[PDB]
Amino acid sequence: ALDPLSETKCTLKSFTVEKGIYQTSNFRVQPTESIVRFPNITNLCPFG
Amino acid sequence: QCVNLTTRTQLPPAYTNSFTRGVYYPDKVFRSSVLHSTQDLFLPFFSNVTWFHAIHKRFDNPVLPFNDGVYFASTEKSNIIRGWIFGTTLDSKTQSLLIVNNATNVVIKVCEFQFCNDPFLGVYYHKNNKSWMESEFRVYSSANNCTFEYVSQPFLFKNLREFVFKNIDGYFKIYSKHTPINLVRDLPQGFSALEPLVDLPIGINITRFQTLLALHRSYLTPGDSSSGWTAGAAAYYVGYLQPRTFLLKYNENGTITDAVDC
Amino acid sequence: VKNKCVNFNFNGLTGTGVLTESNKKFLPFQQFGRDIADTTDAVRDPQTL
Amino acid sequence: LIANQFNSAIGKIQDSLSSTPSALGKLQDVVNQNAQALNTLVKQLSSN
Ligand SMILES: *[C@@H]1O[C@H](CO)[C@@H](O[C@@H]2O[C@H](CO)[C@@H](O)[C@H](O)[C@H]2NC(C)=O)[C@H](O)[C@H]1NC(C)=O
Ligand SMILES: *[C@@H]1O[C@H](CO)[C@@H](O)[C@H](O)[C@H]1NC(C)=O
Ligand SMILES: *[C@@H]1O[C@H](CO)[C@@H](O)[C@H](O)[C@H]1NC(C)=O
Ligand SMILES: *[C@@H]1O[C@H](CO)[C@@H](O)[C@H](O)[C@H]1NC(C)=O
Ligand SMILES: *[C@@H]1O[C@H](CO)[C@@H](O)[C@H](O)[C@H]1NC(C)=O
Ligand SMILES: *[C@@H]1O[C@H](CO)[C@@H](O)[C@H](O)[C@H]1NC(C)=O
């Protein structure tokens, strides 16, 4: 986890990388917030 | 008050084919241009649908056996059919479903009523007031320990009212679709999709169902309220849902336009 | 919040994604849509419809 | 004569390709198969 070349070296498990294009990891956008939406209620349940 | 009155003519009921009728939205999921196959309690195409008449004299309201799901259709303009009553005993021993839809309200009260053996609703009309009002409410003797209550807006031989009543998992589901019908004696061959109206959570054992009709004695009956009455014309159809796999075709707007009985 | 990668749970349907104003026309009893391969891709808000 | 026959043959070939939606099936099959497989894979996510 230093730079893409080192990640390629780790993915190939070798210290020497031949010329080419290699897939190393997956890029994914992590969520930022949380959203809750539910119908309007104003009365508690009769658990009493 | 309970009244047991029968002056109708005796003749065996008629039978018809159900045709491509009685298809409802199985779920509340929107789909566009997708052919979706489901396995639900559907009405087989061209099924053996029973026909009941209420001509003027016929008032046949038998205790039909409500099997797993029941299809029901009506073409009429006098609003003779008001509601339906369900139950295993139709007695004050066990809870019985009861629905009444007159012109003014829809009433659902799940109570174990002491049902009269001949439930009906009586409407009397006078010329001076020019109003049709219901004098006698004799579908049951008394309220008798209601356990569920619900009232909503009324549902509105030239109009077709198609309902599907299905009881599963302690829930009583009603699917209805109002459509203008031009023919006055038989179901049209057109395809119609029934949208859900309400999932009333009743959860009672139901084995036998009945329909509630209304009389319209205004001035043509001279007899007592035990053998004499008069009303209009009504016809209704009863089918039975079976476990069926159906291929439903959704258009781009999300409404079912075609179906296939596998 | 719209146009952001956010978690959500609308009437029990829980997921992660970006919510955008749509042009689909739900019938006034359906709650959410689905794809050809049964994938949730549209949800009606339980408050603003 | 040979040039006219060649030209007529090319024209007939174009007409046959245009007025027959079953000549290119060897390609369509492949596409369909791939799509079908992908669909099946995705639908396998909805199994208990
Ligand atoms: C719901 O009510 C029905 C109708 O009474 C019950 O089914 C009956 O079960 C008895 C058992 O002794 C049979 O003799 C009857 O023939 C059945 N009737 C029918 C129409 O099938 C049913 O058992 C009840 N459900 C539950 C869960 O108790
Ligand atoms: C419908 O029921 C009637 C009862 O009289 C029977 O004669 C007829 O064959 C039935 N039709 C079917 C099962 O398709
Ligand atoms: C209709 O509505 C009211 C309110 O539920 C109810 O009390 C009343 O009895 C109904 N009217 C008739 C004529 O049954
Ligand atoms: C009504 O009330 C009581 C309480 O549930 C019940 O035991 C009784 O049998 C019911 N009676 C009738 C007539 O429905
Ligand atoms: C969907 O509804 C619109 C309303 O503008 C209509 O123009 C269109 O034809 C409908 N589509 C189908 C497939 O019925
Ligand atoms: C509350 O919900 C109602 C019904 O959907 C809506 O008309 C109203 O604007 C809402 N009020 C808010 C969100 O403050």
UniProtKB/Swiss-Prot annotation, chain D:
User: Where do the record's region annotations for Heptad repeat 1 lie?
Assistant: 1-48
State what changing residue 33 to H does: In strain: Omicron/BA.1, Omicron/BA.2, Omicron/BA.2.12.1, Omicron/BA.2.75, Omicron/BA.4, Omicron/BA.5, Omicron/BQ.1.1, Omicron/XBB.1.5, Omicron/EG.5.1
**So what does this one do?**
Subunit of the fusion protein that is processed upon entry into the host cell. Mediates fusion of the virion and cellular membranes by functioning as a class I viral fusion protein. Contains a viral fusion peptide that is unmasked after S2 cleavage. This cleavage can occur at the cell membrane by host TMPRSS2 or during endocytosis by host CSTL. In either case, this triggers an extensive and irreversible conformational change that leads to fusion of the viral envelope with the cellular cytoplasmic membrane, releasing viral genomic RNA into the host cell cytoplasm.
Protein name per its UniProtKB record: Spike protein S2'
Q: Which organism is it from?
A: Severe acute respiratory syndrome coronavirus 2 (2019-nCoV)
Parent-record interval covered: 922 to 969 of 1273
